[PDB]
Amino acid sequence: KEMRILMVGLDGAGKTTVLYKLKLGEVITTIPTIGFNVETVQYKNISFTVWDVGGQDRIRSLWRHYYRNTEGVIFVVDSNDRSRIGEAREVMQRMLNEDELRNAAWLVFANKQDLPEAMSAAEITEKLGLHSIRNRPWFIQATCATSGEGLYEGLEWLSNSLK
Amino acid sequence: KEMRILMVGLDGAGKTTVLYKLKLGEVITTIPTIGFNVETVQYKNISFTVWDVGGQDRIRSLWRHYYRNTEGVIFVVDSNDRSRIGEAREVMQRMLNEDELRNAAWLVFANKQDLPEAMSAAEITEKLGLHSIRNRPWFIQATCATSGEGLYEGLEWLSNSLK
Amino acid sequence: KEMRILMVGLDGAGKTTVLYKLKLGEVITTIPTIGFNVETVQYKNISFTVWDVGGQDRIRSLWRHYYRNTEGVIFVVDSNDRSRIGEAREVMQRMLNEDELRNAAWLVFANKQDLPEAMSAAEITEKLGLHSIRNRPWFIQATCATSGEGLYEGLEWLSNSLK
Amino acid sequence: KEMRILMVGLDGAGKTTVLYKLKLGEVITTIPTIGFNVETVQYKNISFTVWDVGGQDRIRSLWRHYYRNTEGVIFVVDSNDRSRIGEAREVMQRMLNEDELRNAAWLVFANKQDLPEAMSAAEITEKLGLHSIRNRPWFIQATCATSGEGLYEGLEWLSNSLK
Amino acid sequence: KEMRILMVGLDGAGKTTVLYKLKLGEVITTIPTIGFNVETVQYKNISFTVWDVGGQDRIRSLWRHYYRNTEGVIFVVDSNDRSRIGEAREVMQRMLNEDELRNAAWLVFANKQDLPEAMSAAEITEKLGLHSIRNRPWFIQATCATSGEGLYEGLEWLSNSLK
Amino acid sequence: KEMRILMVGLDGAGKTTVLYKLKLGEVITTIPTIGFNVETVQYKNISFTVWDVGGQDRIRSLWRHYYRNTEGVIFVVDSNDRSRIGEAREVMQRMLNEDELRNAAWLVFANKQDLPEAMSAAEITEKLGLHSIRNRPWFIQATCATSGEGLYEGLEWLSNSLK
Amino acid sequence: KEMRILMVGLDGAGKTTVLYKLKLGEVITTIPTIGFNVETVQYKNISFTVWDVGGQDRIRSLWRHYYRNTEGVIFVVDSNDRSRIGEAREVMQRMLNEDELRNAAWLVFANKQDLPEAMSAAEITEKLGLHSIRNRPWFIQATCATSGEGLYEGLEWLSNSLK
Numbered sequence A, B, C, D, E, F, G: 001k002e003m004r005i006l007m008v009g010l011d012g013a014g015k016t017t018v019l020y021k022l023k024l025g026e027v028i029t030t031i032p033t034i035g036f037n038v039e040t041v042q043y044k045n046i047s048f049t050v051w052d053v054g055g056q057d058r059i060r061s062l063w064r065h066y067y068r069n070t071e072g073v074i075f076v077v078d079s080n081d082r083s084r085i086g087e088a089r090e091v092m093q094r095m096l097n098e099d100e101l102r103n104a105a106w107l108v109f110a111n112k113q114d115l116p117e118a119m120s121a122a123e124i125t126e127k128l129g130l131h132s133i134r135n136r137p138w139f140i141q142a143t144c145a146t147s148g149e150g151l152y153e154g155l156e157w158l159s160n161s162l163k
């Protein structure tokens, strides 16, 4: 009936694009997210309330204001960006150790799969150290926010962890 | 008057196909089940509420959310897949030891009997270690969800364990 | 005015045929009874509510759900099947020791008397150890469900144990 | 109204099979009993609570945890195993000298009588030194857990020592 | 209803893997255990609270903080590691002489039996000097945490020493 | 209700084995007894508290610490060791002259009778000069601690000298 | 639930950087620590209260004000600084002899491992004389506060010495 979500990731990942592909159905032009966007999207008789936030180094320290009462998390990672996959691992291993996100479900959108140099979801699952997760449910999906592929299959998995 | 069921199994078994052969009467095209499907089907003045779930390795850890208040279980096994009959045995022996499914009735759909290389229900009864079950009623039926054979004979047995 | 009955026996005996010879008057084609059938039949201003159940080895363990509030029992035995008369004796001596059927009246339909190799009701009375019954009223009748012989003479005896 | 029982013996005897032949009525497949099984069975308006335990050399030292508040004991001995009848005698003469089982009734199931090389109950009564028992009531019955013979005649004797 | 357990052993044995094979059912990737992990697992209406600890030489001196109020111990030994079987013997003979573990039950998981060069449970029982144990119940089981074999047969034995 | 015992003898006799055959019921592996073992065993509503001590030449001089308040003594002699029967005679004639053991009952376990070259209890009674005992009750029993023979017949005799 | 920590070391080590890498997650610019910094960081349901202090020669004499009620100590040593490893040894051997830190747990962050000329944790363990520690638990971890490596593995070890 209701669910709260927090979309996060590094800069350039695709968070805003994913959100406004789910909410509107169209690919909008984007500006860097200094503040935050919040939007409700309905699916399977469930109303997800997604909070997209900034990924710039200066806003990554303000994500803590949103950890509270968060039932799911969506970590978006740019697959073409193979040089910052270590920074994302640092961020995610730091945010998995926070106690406010202790029960949160973990979903990972490996975005930008339409690009030729994109890296597979298994290569990302290995590079991010996702099998090391033990206190938490987790899942990884390959997406293309510009085409909508894999986006409605993530909200479908998040439904498993309802209530 | 009412009954709750949980259809489970490995990937590729036939759970979704069975469910929407009971509910609609037609063989639908299928996509991998990331989330869950739920459907009510009436038979013998009884309204079974079936929950079909995913079998991918990543969703097999989310089945626990559904064990509660479950009155029957339907384990679907692909008979042609003779290489994963040990993995199914592991899953079933693990899920028989859970205390939330302590009184649940056990039914086993040995599906894909229309295939030439299919294995008999007795060979499956031996490979799955079903005679070792002692705290639980159990039953095994040979099916073909594409043709509907053996599907209405399972709901008929589940009626024995009503109320 | 009312009476509850439980028809039981091994597989192949004639339970379903007896029931739908009493209820309809015609000999129906039959399928193995996986679940249960229930039918009310009126006779002598009495409405017997008969529950026919499966005899397969897998359903013989589900008969316990029906023992409660059962006022009469009808054990059907195939007379031509002279090789399974010991298994029926085991089943009946086990079900006579249950405390839910403590006051139940016992009737025995020695069916398939039309067959040449059929065994007499006295030979069955000896093989089943029926004279050993002491806590219970009992009676044995020779039948032929295909012709209706001996069927209305069993419901007539069950009337003796009304209320 | 109630009674507590402890089924014990060497490995391979038939304890689990006896228990789940009394409780279910069917012969189950078995695994070695590392821990313990406990089951209540009703008979003659009495509810026996049977505790089946392991017979492996490593578990024979954990039986002491169960001696307390035990009103009857059932020693199962394999008759075909004529080479371990001395080890069983040692175990039984040791467990007859324990003070927690000081008033316990003794019953002996000489099981596996269906086998051709089985040894008579009198030969076992002589080999086990049962007439040497003087502080205790005792009884020996010849059984066949696969067929149920002699099993309901042991619970019948245990009723003599009620309350 | 409750029970406390302490899983210990040398480094590389399989403690964390065993714990999160019992708790989750999946084989997780692992990091060296510097601190401690604690997890509750339910089985046979009993809630075992397992404490997995480090085996590095620097943490083997911090196990004493956990000896108190410990009702069972699970010593995991790598069978393929035939060069450190003496070090494990030293550790176990030292920890058997502690007075806080005076009543603790002893279980030994001889893990990594799937490897070809693995050593039998009897060879380990001889090398570890387990028959020398006299003040304590003990048991040894052959396992394969990657496949789950022998893991639910250890918790089954630990139930013998309940309360 | 209570009784104190001192088990003594030369090295290799069988003292520890006897004690932990009475206490546990199993034959344990053994190490030389440098210190002492103490164990309580119940039999015939009597709780014997047995103190097993070392027999090495260096510990035979520390037995005096235990003579006090000792109500019975159990001298174990290896029968196969026919070359040290004179040393045992010296030890026993020395320990019979001590005034702290002035009222102690004397029992002699002629152990290792299962060996072919074992010497009879009468040959030992002659070699040990047991008939020369006049200030003391005495008794000699032939044993086999590995099989338990003759062990419960010694505690039975020690009961004669209760209180 | 709570724990008090004292981070100390020589000047240039990395104490402030470590603290504000644990607390904020970012690498801050730093000024020499004339006074003291204090910060609470949560991890594993534990709230560590860390006190970072100055390392200048003039402030090393004011550390005594903080020894009291200190449950853990974190000695940070610059590995690249191979010329002051003797001064750190002096400081640490002096502060290990204080009676207010008598029960404190010892952790050693060998920081600046990202530098090419860095010295291994074993070379530091030898140069600092850490094996000479006998009245205290101790542990050494290799870190890189700029990247966060090895920092959450120290707080993990400090949890072993809780309460």
Ligand SMILES: Nc1nc2c(ncn2[C@@H]2O[C@H](COP(=O)(O)OP(=O)(O)OP(O)(O)=S)[C@@H](O)[C@H]2O)c(=O)[nH]1
Pocket (backbone or CB within 6 Å): A010, A011, A012, A013, A014, A015, A016, A017, A018, A030, A031, A032, A033, A034, A053, A054, A055, A056, A111, A112, A113, A114, A115, A143, A144, A145, A146, A147
């Ligand atoms: N070619 C391609 N571009 C994508 C895809 N997904 C997202 N993008 C594009 O990549 C750019 C960055 O996406 P954007 O949503 O603006 O970043 P962000 O996640 O919000 O992070 P920020 O707000 O801190 S800059 C955008 O131009 C967007 O259109 C994809 O699948 N393929």
Ligand SMILES: Nc1nc2c(ncn2[C@@H]2O[C@H](COP(=O)(O)OP(=O)(O)OP(O)(O)=S)[C@@H](O)[C@H]2O)c(=O)[nH]1
Pocket (backbone or CB within 6 Å): B010, B011, B012, B013, B014, B015, B016, B017, B018, B030, B031, B032, B033, B034, B053, B054, B055, B056, B111, B112, B113, B114, B115, B143, B144, B145, B146, B147
């Ligand atoms: N030839 C044949 N195909 C069958 C039969 N039963 C089911 N299937 C087919 O096998 C395929 C897998 O069935 P499906 O229901 O989609 O898997 P699942 O049980 O839902 O598991 P999943 O959702 O995690 S992929 C489908 O293409 C389905 O049509 C059968 O009896 N014969």
Ligand SMILES: Nc1nc2c(ncn2[C@@H]2O[C@H](COP(=O)(O)OP(=O)(O)OP(O)(O)=S)[C@@H](O)[C@H]2O)c(=O)[nH]1
Pocket (backbone or CB within 6 Å): C010, C011, C012, C013, C014, C015, C016, C017, C018, C030, C031, C032, C033, C034, C053, C054, C055, C056, C111, C112, C113, C114, C115, C143, C144, C145, C146, C147
């Ligand atoms: N020749 C003959 N056939 C009989 C007679 N009575 C019953 N049958 C036949 O024997 C067959 C078995 O009877 P049926 O009623 O289907 O078994 P059941 O008692 O219901 O047991 P099941 O449902 O577990 S298979 C049927 O083909 C039935 O028609 C009889 O008197 N003579």
Ligand SMILES: Nc1nc2c(ncn2[C@@H]2O[C@H](COP(=O)(O)OP(=O)(O)OP(O)(O)=S)[C@@H](O)[C@H]2O)c(=O)[nH]1
Pocket (backbone or CB within 6 Å): D010, D011, D012, D013, D014, D015, D016, D017, D018, D030, D031, D032, D033, D034, D053, D054, D055, D056, D111, D112, D113, D114, D115, D143, D144, D145, D146, D147
């Ligand atoms: N042929 C035959 N087999 C029997 C009989 N009674 C029991 N058994 C069989 O002998 C085997 C051992 O019986 P089982 O009950 O598993 O041993 P146990 O008493 O439980 O001892 P354990 O659990 O320590 S292995 C089983 O395969 C069982 O089926 C009998 O009367 N005849």
Ligand SMILES: Nc1nc2c(ncn2[C@@H]2O[C@H](COP(=O)(O)OP(=O)(O)OP(O)(O)=S)[C@@H](O)[C@H]2O)c(=O)[nH]1
Pocket (backbone or CB within 6 Å): E010, E011, E012, E013, E014, E015, E016, E017, E018, E030, E031, E032, E033, E034, E053, E054, E055, E056, E111, E112, E113, E114, E115, E143, E144, E145, E146, E147
């Ligand atoms: N091939 C194989 N590997 C196993 C088995 N059991 C455990 N392992 C593997 O051996 C490795 C060590 O297991 P692990 O659980 O991490 O060590 P530990 O007991 O926790 O000790 P540590 O934390 O101080 S490093 C792991 O890679 C694990 O996956 C097995 O049965 N077969």
Ligand SMILES: Nc1nc2c(ncn2[C@@H]2O[C@H](COP(=O)(O)OP(=O)(O)OP(O)(O)=S)[C@@H](O)[C@H]2O)c(=O)[nH]1
Pocket (backbone or CB within 6 Å): F010, F011, F012, F013, F014, F015, F016, F017, F018, F030, F031, F032, F033, F034, F053, F054, F055, F056, F111, F112, F113, F114, F115, F143, F144, F145, F146, F147
């Ligand atoms: N073959 C055989 N061995 C026995 C018998 N009784 C005891 N032993 C064996 O003889 C050996 C010595 O027994 P043990 O109990 O260890 O000596 P001790 O009396 O304690 O003296 P010690 O502790 O100073 S070495 C052991 O290996 C034991 O198992 C027996 O009846 N037959």
Ligand SMILES: Nc1nc2c(ncn2[C@@H]2O[C@H](COP(=O)(O)OP(=O)(O)OP(O)(O)=S)[C@@H](O)[C@H]2O)c(=O)[nH]1
Pocket (backbone or CB within 6 Å): G010, G011, G012, G013, G014, G015, G016, G017, G018, G030, G031, G032, G033, G034, G053, G054, G055, G056, G111, G112, G113, G114, G115, G143, G144, G145, G146, G147
């Ligand atoms: N290259 C590199 N620099 C590091 C590392 N760890 C800490 N530092 C850097 O070394 C410098 C000293 O660290 P700092 O935390 O300010 O010293 P301090 O421990 O607080 O001691 P002080 O306050 O008395 S000056 C800083 O510029 C810091 O950024 C590292 O791992 N690699």
Ligand SMILES: [Mg+2]
Pocket (backbone or CB within 6 Å): A015, A016, A017, A031, A032, A033, A052, A053, A054
């Ligand atoms: Mg954005």
Ligand SMILES: [Mg+2]
Pocket (backbone or CB within 6 Å): B015, B016, B017, B031, B032, B033, B052, B053, B054
């Ligand atoms: Mg599906």
Ligand SMILES: [Mg+2]
Pocket (backbone or CB within 6 Å): C015, C016, C017, C031, C032, C033, C052, C053, C054
């Ligand atoms: Mg029928």
Ligand SMILES: [Mg+2]
Pocket (backbone or CB within 6 Å): D015, D016, D017, D031, D032, D033, D052, D053, D054
């Ligand atoms: Mg058993």
Ligand SMILES: [Mg+2]
Pocket (backbone or CB within 6 Å): E015, E016, E017, E031, E032, E033, E052, E053, E054
């Ligand atoms: Mg570990």
Ligand SMILES: [Mg+2]
Pocket (backbone or CB within 6 Å): F015, F016, F017, F031, F032, F033, F052, F053, F054
């Ligand atoms: Mg000794």
Ligand SMILES: [Mg+2]
Pocket (backbone or CB within 6 Å): G015, G016, G017, G031, G032, G033, G052, G053, G054
């Ligand atoms: Mg500083």
